[PDB]
Amino acid sequence: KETAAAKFERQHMDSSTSAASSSNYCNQMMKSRNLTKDRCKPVNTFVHESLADVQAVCSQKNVACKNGQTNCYQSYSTMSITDCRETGSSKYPNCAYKTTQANKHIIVACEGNPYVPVHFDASV
Ligand SMILES: Cc1cn(Cc2cn([C@@H]3O[C@@H](CO)[C@H](O)[C@H]3O)nn2)c(=O)[nH]c1=O
């Protein structure tokens, strides 16, 4: 079974590229990471930092989660990320996405022992 921590890595980690996400990066990645299986997942962010650096965020700046829970953490440093946002003309199963690279602080929700990221909450 896929753990919550594993699902976060599949949905949100892409350490293999620095940023250089082409204009088709999201179209490709949303498909390959299986986020277009039952529906076009409308928004999803990939983090291009090492897994260790992202996992380390769980011991960084504690902040409120968008849902009001208190287990979210904001990175002290900006991180290379790519936001994927479904286009207006996108039609399942042919999910289409706008690919936007940025450098921003991430906010993740962390849970468990070991305490690791399980949701991507926001970037600021
Ligand atoms: C605003 C925002 C949302 N998301 C979606 C998300 C949430 N999650 C969490 O993990 C899944 C498990 O239920 C859910 O989609 C959400 O809880 N995964 N992707 C981004 O990726 N970047 C963002 O800037």
DSSP-assigned beta bridge partners for residue 120: 108
Cβ atoms within 10 Å of 118's Cβ, excluding its own: 18
Question: Could you tell me if 61 and 73 are in contact, meaning their C-beta atoms sit under 8 angstroms apart?
Answer: yes
Domains and CATH numbers, the chain: 1-124 (3.10.130.10)
Q: Please indicate if the annotation marks 61 as binding a ligand.
A: no
CB of 102 sitting under 6 A from ligand 1: no
The Cα 11–Cα 95 span in angstroms is 16
Ligand 1 pocket mutation pick from 34, 120, 124 by most atoms within 8 angstroms of CB: 120
The Cα 22–Cα 76 span in angstroms is 27
DSSP-assigned beta bridge partners for residue 80: 103
| Half-sphere exposure in the Cβ direction for 29 (13 Å, CA) | 30
CB of 82 sitting under 6 A from ligand 1: no
Contacts of 121 by beta carbon, 8 Å cutoff, 6+ apart: 65, 66, 72, 107, 108, 109
Q: Where do we find the tokens 């390959």?
A: 32
CA of 121 to the centre of ligand 1 (A): 6
Q: What is the resolution of this structure in A?
A: 1.8
Cα dihedral across residues 116, 119, 120, 122: positive or negative: negative
Q: Please indicate if the annotation marks 66 as binding a ligand.
A: yes
Q: Is 105 a catalytic residue?
A: no
The experimental technique used to determine this model is X-ray
CA of 65 to the centre of ligand 1 (A): 12
Q: Is 12 a catalytic residue?
A: yes
DSSP state of 42: S
DSSP state of 84: E
The Cα 82–Cα 99 span in angstroms is 7
